[PDB]
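Input:
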Amino acid sequence: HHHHGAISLISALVRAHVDSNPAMTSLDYSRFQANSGDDTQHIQQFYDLLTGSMEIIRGWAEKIPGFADLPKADQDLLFESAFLELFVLRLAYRSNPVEGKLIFCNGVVLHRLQCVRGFGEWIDSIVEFSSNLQNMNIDISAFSCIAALAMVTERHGLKEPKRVEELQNKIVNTLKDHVTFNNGGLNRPNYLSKLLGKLPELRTLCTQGLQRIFYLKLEDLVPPPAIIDKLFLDTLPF
Amino acid sequence: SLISALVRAHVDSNPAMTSLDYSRFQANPDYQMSGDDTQHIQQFYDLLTGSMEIIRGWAEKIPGFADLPKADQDLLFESAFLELFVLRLAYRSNPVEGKLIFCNGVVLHRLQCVRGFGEWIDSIVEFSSNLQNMNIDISAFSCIAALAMVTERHGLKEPKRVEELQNKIVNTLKDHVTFNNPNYLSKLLGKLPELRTLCTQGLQRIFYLKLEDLVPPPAIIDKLFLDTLPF
Ligand SMILES: *SCCNC(=O)COc1ccc(Cl)c(Cl)c1
Ligand SMILES: [Cl-]
Ligand SMILES: [Cl-]
Ligand SMILES: [Cl-]
Ligand SMILES: [Cl-]
Ligand SMILES: [Cl-]
Ligand SMILES: [Cl-]
Ligand SMILES: [Cl-]
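Output:
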């Protein structure tokens, strides 16, 4: 059986994920090197990879059912306080952690060693989380709800926290329906609990990214673009 | 009498070297990294806020500071507090014995400090040994501490009254080095840039604790953290 609206919801969530992801069949290995340059170039690349995904991740956000119906202030805070979380999660799902290949949403493929000078040791945690994520063998339907749950959660400063809460419960309900239906009606309480357990791991992982942005901002070798600053200020807690 | 006024302002806002407080001190490493993280983070905040009342009284006892517009007095204080907190701690402490001595006389071992201060305390101790190897007398330190707060800022109301106060302090410092000591003044005044870099390590630590949200900073620490972020 299925919740009412569960099939149409999870279908729209899968379409949102597929439409906002890079063509694996036609990716870009132009700068890929398995085994350097100045610091300013690597930091600028770090900023540029973050910025380029912002517009794509918000396009994915606008294709979640009911997300557009929220107030714009709620849409902005939800998207902003979840951007790095979505950036990390979608990068960890997309990448090849065994080969150290980081695959970004514009299709650019870079090796883990090519990213350490921009990302810092934060790239080592992203690779580790990617292996753990991929070891769970999460299909696209279950991933698409987990991705939407990373954004549709409670945040301080929401104007109408119910529609968020009401949308979040519907996403949880259709993730449960899928896990049960896919397994032939047999519930999987372990896979689900481990699946939802990846959201706090992702939140912890994206504080490491905020510390990296704060570090680069204070040392002031390459100032962040204005939109990285706005991302930083609008999401500082309390 | 200006440098004597700065020396007395330092002496009055600092614990008498014989009235040290070992009530919290612990030499045994088994007990130096004990207890929950909450009381360790809270003690970290409490030492920071406990130094605000002390450094503020030290600033008011600097000749001419109180004669500035208080909007400038607050901008000067609230933008050098962490630098002053670290500089006075590094000058007060016993880095070779691993003893950090705070402005209330409380003595804590370095290993008692890592749970709250984090990695930051190692860099503080390193800076503390480098500072004391210069054997800066109390007269030159009182000038240097004042110069950490009486300096260039964006948004002051009479910035050249601060500058004229600043250069009065610089001139008497140079007069002191002349009478008493290529000189250590170049590396001494260079310790203020190195202090600033050490201060931004402290902001990283407070930023981390804010993100962890185990014990959120008090409003006063949160305000001054937010007020020194470069946008
Ligand atoms: S880095 C320049 C030194 N002084 C300051 O930053 C202002 O004093 C502060 C700064 C940050 C925090 Cl959290 C406090 Cl409590 C005081
Ligand atoms: Cl796309
Ligand atoms: Cl995919
Ligand atoms: Cl691959
Ligand atoms: Cl949830
Ligand atoms: Cl389904
Ligand atoms: Cl559940
Ligand atoms: Cl100077």
